[PDB]
Design a protein around this ligand. Structure first.
Ligand SMILES: NC(=O)C1=CN([C@@H]2O[C@H](COP(=O)(O)OP(=O)(O)OC[C@H]3O[C@@H](n4cnc5c(N)ncnc54)[C@H](OP(=O)(O)O)[C@@H]3O)[C@@H](O)[C@H]2O)C=CC1
Length: 456
C-alpha cells in the first residue's frame, strides 16, 4: 500500500471523542504496560502523530504476476474446489439479517459515507425483527456503491512503545451500501469458509479455538513452521489482489472482481481530507478478514515454489487467520528463506524458528491466534487453546464500561482456565483480593473443564 494522492475532502468529518478506557478495579492488582493515542495533542507522543499512523504504507512492488504466483493460484484454487462455492448471490435479506454461515450484519459498526453525516443510523434502516429489506434497496438506489472509506482510529490498548511511537491502529470503515452488495456477491463464499475452517479453505476465520484447536495438529501433522507479518494488510501490493482476482475467476466469478478493485484502489476520508490508496487491504470491508486469508494462502504457496524449485504441494497444508500463519510440510524447510524471498515482493515476515541457535518450531512453542497449544493430561488428543496470563493480565487492568465487569471477567475466565488449576486459583485469588470482585460470580475450574469437554 502506497498513497498516490490526498486533497480537500469537502466534508468536516467529525473529530473523534475521548477514549472510553478507564483503569479497572484491578489496575493496581495485576502488572501491566495503556490506551491508544487518538489525537495529535495527546501528552504522551514522542514523535509526530499523523506521521506514525499512515507509515503502515510502505509502497508497492509494482509488477506482473510471475511464474511462481500463477502456480500457487492453481494449487489453491484446486484446494478449494471440493468445497463447491456457489458464485450465485444471496438474497438481500440474507446479506442484511444473515443466514447459515453468515451472522446478521453487525449493528454497532458505523455505516460510514454518506450516512454518518446525514443522521441515518443503521438502527433506523435495518429493523431486524421484521427482516425489512426495503430501506436498503432505495438506499443502494440513492448512493450506489464504490463509496469512500471513513477512517477512525481504533479505540484499544497498545504497548508502551506503540503509544510512545504513535503506532496506533486505524479502522478504514467502508459504507453500508458497500457492505451489503459484497455480502451479496460472496455470502456463500463467506458461508463456505465460515462453516469449513481447515486446510481446504486454509483458514480459521470464525473458528472456536476452545474446540477447533484439537483438530489443528491432525490436519497439519507434518513438520510445521509459522509466520507473523509486519504491517501485513498494508504490505500488500496490487498484484496479490490480482492473484486473488485470478483465484476467484477459477471459482467461476465474473463481474464480481469489481469488489477487489474496490479494495485495491481505495478512497478514504480522514478529516477534511480525501486520500486515495493503491495496494493495501482496508480493515473495515465486508470480507477484509476472509480476503486477507486467501491472499496469505497465495503468498505462502508462492514463497515455497520460488525458493524450493523442485517441490510437490499435494502434501502441503496451511491455516491462516488474516496475517497469522501456521503451516506444515513433510520435510524440513527454511522459513527464514521464505521470509527472505518474500522481501522481493515487499513483505516483512518473521518465522517462529529464528535460526540455528533457535529450537525448531514445535507444537509446544508455536502459536496461532495469539494462543499457544497444550495437550490435556487425561485425554492427550485434546488441545487446550492456551492464552498467556500476561495477555489476560493486561486485558483486566482497564475497563470500557465498569457496569460490564462481570461479563468482562467471566469472558476472561473461560480463556484463563486453560492455563491450569493452580494458575486459575492464583487468578481468582488475585481477583478476590479487592472489594469489587469479592461478590463476583466466578466459574469454578471443574465447571469450565466439564463445559469444555461437552463442546465436542
Ligand atoms: N453461531 C455461534 O453461536 C457462534 C458464533 N461465533 C462468532 O462469529 C464470529 C465469526 O465471524 P468472524 O470470526 O467475526 O469473521 P468476520 O465476520 O469478523 O470477518 C469479517 C471481516 O469483514 C469486516 N466486516 C464488515 N462488516 C462487518 C460486520 N457487520 N461485522 C463484523 N465484521 C465486519 C471485519 O473487519 P472489522 O473487524 O474492521 O469490522 C472482519 O475483518 C466469531 O468470531 C464469533 O464471535 C463463533 C462461535 C459460535
Amino acid at each position: 500500500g502506497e498513497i498516490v494522492s490526498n486533497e480537500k475532502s469537502g466534508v468536516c468529518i467529525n473529530a473523534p471523542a475521548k477514549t472510553k478506557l478507564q483503569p479497572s478495579v484491578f489496575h493496581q492488582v495485576f502488572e501491566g504496560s495503556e490506551p491508544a493515542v487518538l489525537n495529535s495533542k495527546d501528552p504522551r507522543l514522542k514523535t509526530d502523530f499523523e506521521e506514525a499512523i499512515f507509515s503502515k504504507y510502505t509502497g508497492n512492488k509494482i509488477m506482473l504476476m510471475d511464474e511462481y504466483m500463477e502456480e500457487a493460484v492453481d494449487h489453491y484454487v484446486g484446494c478449494l474446489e471440493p468445497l463447491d462455492i456457489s458464485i450465485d448471490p444471496i438474497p438481500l435479506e440474507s446479506a442484511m439479517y444473515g443466514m447459515d454461515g453468515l451472522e446478521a450484519l453487525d449493528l454497532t459498526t458505523s455505516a460510514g459515507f454518506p450516512y454518518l453525516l446525514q443522521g441515518k443510523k443503521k438502527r433506523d434502516i435495518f429493523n431486524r425483527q421484521t427482516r425489512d429489506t426495503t430501506e436498503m434497496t432505495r438506499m443502494l438506489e440513492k448512493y450506489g456503491v464504490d463509496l469512500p472509506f471513513v477512517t477512525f482510529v481504533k479505540d484499544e490498548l497498545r504497548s508502551r512503545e506503540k503509544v510512545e511511537k504513535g503506532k496506533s491502529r486505524l479502522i478504514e470503515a467502508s459504507s453500508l451500501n458497500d457492505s451489503v452488495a459484497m455480502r451479496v456477491a460472496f455470502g456463500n463464499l463467506y458461508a463456505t469458509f465460515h462453516n469449513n475452517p481447515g486446510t481446504a479453505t486454509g483458514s480459521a476465520v470464525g473458528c472456536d479455538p476452545d474446540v477447533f484447536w484439537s483438530k489443528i495438529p491432525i490436519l497439519l501433522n507434518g513438520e510445521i513452521f509459522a509466520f507473523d507479518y509486519t504491517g501485513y494488510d498494508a504490505s500488500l501490493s496490487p498484484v496479490w489482489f490480482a492473484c486473488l482476482k485470478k483465484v476467484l475467476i477459477k471459482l467461476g466469478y465474473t463481474h464480481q472482481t469489481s469488489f477487489i478493485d474496490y479494495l485495491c484502489h481505495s478512497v478514504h476520508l480522514y478529516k477534511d481530507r480525501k486520500y486515495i490508496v493503491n495496494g493495501g487491504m482496508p480493515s473495515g470491508s465486508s470480507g477484509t478478514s476472509i480476503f486477507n486469508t486467501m491472499i496469505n494462502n497465495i503468498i505462502i504457496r508462492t514463497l515455497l515454489i520460488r525458493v524450493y524449485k523442485g517441490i510437490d504441494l499435494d502434501q502441503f497444508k496451511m491455516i491462516a487467520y488474516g496475517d497469522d500463519v501456521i503451516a506444515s510440510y513433510p520435510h524440513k524447510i527454511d522459513p527464514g528463506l521464505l521470509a527472505e524471498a518474500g522481501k522481493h515482493y515487499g513483505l516483512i515476515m518473521t518465522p517462529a524458528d529464528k535460526g540455528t541457535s533457535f529450537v525448531d518450531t514445535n507444537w509446544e512453542n508455536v502459536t496461532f491466534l495469539k494462543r499457544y497449544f497444550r495437550a490435556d493430561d487425561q485425554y492427550p488428543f485434546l488441545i487446550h487453546p492456551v492464552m498467556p496470563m500476561k495477555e489476560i493480565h493486561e486485558s483486566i487492568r482497564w475497563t470500557k464500561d465498569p457496569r460490564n465487569t462481570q461479563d468482562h471477567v467471566r469472558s476472561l475466565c473461560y480463556l484463563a482456565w486453560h492455563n491450569g488449576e493452580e494458575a486459575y486459583n492464583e487468578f481468582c485469588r488475585k481477583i478476590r483480593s479487592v472489594p469489587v470482585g469479592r461478590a463476583l460470580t466466578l466459574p469454578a475450574y471443574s465447571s469450565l473443564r466439564r463445559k469444555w469437554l461437552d463442546s465436542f
